[PDB]
Ligand binder design. Structure first.
Ligand code: VO4
Ligand SMILES: [Cl-]
Lengths: 458, 458
């Protein structure tokens, strides 16, 4: 029931199956940007590579698959290349979802046992393109296969092979100027301590630049607790934002915090030309992948503490005015040792903000695609639809709209402070960081579009 | 499709629903004894109190609910009382399964909104009995409500309020004489450190004795890493068990490691008389709850290291002849820092063995109820039905049978060493512990059946 000649296989066949799998596999809140954006970058650049011969000049990022006559550039042909290259990438990234990927193909009539690599057919181009992405990314340094350092047994995808250790335990703040893992429980009586997710990411191969070394942000000096005044001030800002939350801040925090929810507000930016959609989506999420890698390089270098670690340190034995938790509204007697961010604070150091650097990179790419600051980004949440306070937030039906790329970025920054997971400085540093990677990935893909292979993916 | 006059509530209506809910909520492997056995003891002791008025002399544990004419001691009325007590206990322990517990009652024709407490009706007796269990057990020191210590906000069920902290880190063995959390991943890209599950349990209120502190087991002198000779030998045992695993060892390890699959081996041990079934279950799983509690008191007291910790310390930098991981059979090049137990090692200190102490308790109640060492424990697994090596173990359909309670207890104790999760010493200590607790639970239940209230559970 999909129209190869007129539909968009991404929006109608691929996304409806890959989004849910990602939530089922990784996290119900699509919160783990280095995992979801690896899927996102790898899948969609495989679209770019699988359909490059149907463009007048484009060459692929991971493969050089030649040229086809412009008359073969049918909607059906692009769609078919897309579905097969997705198939190979997802079979590499999420093998335990083998059945789901086969069904992705068979539900639209294609055969998942067709492993042809004929560069004259859209199935061969899809297969060749997806296999090339998989061959170039399985051992890119992120440890997708848990084999780095010659590990033959008990392989765990994306395990850290680089020996990162935190200097605080989840139970003792030994160093308030350094990251501390949070103790977390889903509510079933099991408790676990966070572990720096994809701590090795900083060593993985980027797309649009050679080394994250050259995207170093400045030291987060307000997070040096010996700078007593600036350290206490940013913590006071996080407590005020917590104490003063509005429904709209809560939701804007929830929006920018879930990458799938975030992308779902973009259906007003989508071109009607399939090739255009592919080229924009490739630059967008190559920017996302690369900015996450730059963010994680920075995050590991500075190893900065999340707000709760500062609030616990500064306000020990005290009771704070803050958000009281689901359905409690603001309270005056939050014990500092129980205080939580509104959002669940993620499993990595605080500085800078990965979500914000992805917002900024995406807006940089957005501007370069549409020529100006104009956009149309939308989020609609029914009464009680919040995923932090279901049944309480928002109190009434809510529509949030952005029409300027910059104001959206600014809100995304603000929202991590409202969310409780970042100090102001992290979000500010991520604006310039995202801007740079978003332009560099735009120029990287645009070069390839224009027939110029650049970089070292091949 | 349930016959109130001839069927069994537990086996036909309740267990097929509570079991799968316990797997969804807590763990696909029913391996977290302190939470499974809380559900087990509280549900079934609620049965015992629901139906005690229908026995000529029985008085309840958490309530005194009077006496019913012998003419009313019908199967129909027992089942009805069981279902309503269960309803109130599950609504307390697992409130997010509201729809499941409601459907548990509507599916055999009962109104989940019947509030009645009329002690002349099976409905009111069930409600009253379950309400009493709930009122006595919500604030028993297990911190089910997350409220201990006056915590009003961000309540997490069963969170520790007693300040347990490990002296080891997931990433560094400061002290090989003390417990170390494992770093664990579901295959997800996400990684978390274990936290001592229900570290507070030693403080909670037991059934059949006042205080676990009178139930201490011997000092584990071989888990002291400076007593070098003895420390090494027991690690060497665990390695040799790992290297020399066989399909039957593997399957017994799995059998005693999953509390629900263990309970599945007891089919030829159910009474036909429904009242007799409630009384044996109550003795059995009050025995389990009380041996969990005493085990945890000892685990916390001794804070002993798991085998993987000692192996990593002793054989740092070497390769080992061990189990290679799923489908790998035995290999000679397992790096020490990669060695894992066959079972997934549990999130609590090593000494003594909770599963064995449960096995030993369950076997003691079975003796006192059955008149001696004779029993009928069966466990069948189709080819490839392992949950550690799905599709590899076992080769060939396998049947395992125990006829002697003591044989079963020795196999459980041995299975934890085959499993890689315990040293021998911990599994031997649990025998004396489980015998004592199983006995005191049986005598504690037996007194209540006979009409003599004992203890402080009212
Ligand atoms: O549940 V155990 O204490 O035998 O690892
Ligand atoms: Cl900067």
């Amino acid at each position: 029931a999909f129209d190869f000649t007129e539909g968009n296989s991404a929006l109608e066949v691929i996304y409806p199956r890959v989004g849910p799998a990602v939530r089922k596999h990784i996290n119900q809140v699509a919160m783990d940007g280095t995992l979801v954006l690896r899927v996102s970058a790898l899948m969609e650049s495989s679209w770019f590579d699988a359909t490059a011969p149907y463009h007048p000049t484009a060459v692929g990022i991971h493969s050089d698959l030649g040229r086809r006559p412009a008359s073969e550039a049918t909607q059906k042909n692009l769609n078919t290349a897309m579905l097969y290259s997705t198939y190979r990438v997802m079979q590499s990234l999420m093998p335990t979802y083998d059945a789901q990927w086969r069904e992705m193909l068979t539900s639209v009539g294609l055969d998942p046992d067709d492993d042809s690599t004929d560069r004259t057919t859209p199935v061969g181009l899809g297969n060749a393109a997806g296999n090339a992405v998989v061959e170039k990314r399985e051992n890119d340094g992120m440890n997708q296969l848990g084999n780095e350092g010659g590990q033959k047994y008990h392989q765990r995808p994306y395990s850290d092979y680089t020996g990162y250790k935190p200097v605080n335990t989840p139970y003792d703040i030994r160093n308030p100027s350094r990251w501390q893992p949070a103790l977390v429980s889903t509510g079933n009586g099991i408790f676990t301590a966070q572990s720096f997710v994809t701590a090795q990411l900083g060593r993985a191969k980027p797309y649009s630049f050679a080394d994250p070394k050259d995207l170093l942000v400045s030291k987060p000096r307000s997070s040096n607790h010996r700078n007593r005044a600036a350290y206490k001030r940013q913590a006071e800002e996080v407590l005020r934002a917590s104490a003063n939350l509005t429904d709209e801040q809560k939701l804007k925090a929830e929006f920018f915090n879930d990458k799938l929810i975030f992308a779902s507000g973009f259906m007003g930016e989508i071109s009607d030309d399939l090739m255009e959609f592919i080229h924009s989506a490739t630059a967008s999420h190559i920017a996302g992948f690369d900015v996450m890698l730059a963010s994680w390089y920075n995050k590991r270098k500075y190893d900065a503490p999340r707000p709760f670690t500062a609030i616990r340190y500064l306000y020990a034995g005290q009771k704070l005015r803050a958000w009281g938790g689901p359905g409690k509204g603001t309270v005056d007697d939050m014990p500092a040792e129980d205080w939580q961010s509104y959002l669940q604070v993620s499993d990595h150091p605080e500085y800078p903000s990965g979500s914000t650097a992805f917002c900024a990179a995406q807006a940089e790419v957005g501007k370069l695609v549409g020529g100006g600051d104009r956009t149309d980004i939308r989020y609609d949440v029914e009464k009680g639809g919040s995923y932090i306070e279901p049944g309480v937030t928002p109190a009434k039906d809510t529509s949030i709209r952005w029409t300027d790329w910059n104001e959206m970025v600014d809100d995304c920054a603000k929202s991590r402070v409202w969310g409780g997971v970042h100090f102001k400085a992290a979000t500010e540093a991520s604006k310039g960081l995202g801007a740079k990677v978003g332009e560099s990935s735009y120029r990287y893909v645009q070069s390839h579009i224009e027939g110029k292979q650049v970089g070292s993916m091949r």
